[PDB]
RNA sequence: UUGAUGUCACGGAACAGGAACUUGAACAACAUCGUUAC
């Protein structure tokens, strides 16, 4: 039994340079959701081994958003 | 609220002394954000 430490989705990297993990995609990446408790994961950084998931994104401009951190913490 | 036979109060400048002063280039490069894996 214990408390849940939930801080939200962070560890985000945003740019316009079209980095390596935003390019290796399956096309038509979605736009930015308006609230949390809704942002789910989209792709994997490693594809042969099911390692760390990511979330590639976009907006009305050419800003590319990638995000790690698929977990929260819990102290008991 | 006066008292008578005697009021120059128009008989008297609120006047005389004290620096809103001292100190200050409209200028500029290194990051921000947190977790993943056994």
UniProtKB/TrEMBL annotation:
It comes from the Bacteria. This is CRISPR-associated RAMP family protein. It comes from Desulfonema ishimotonii. The lineage of its organism: Bacteria, Pseudomonadati, Thermodesulfobacteriota, Desulfobacteria, Desulfobacterales. The chain holds residues 1145 to 1220 of 1601 of the full protein.
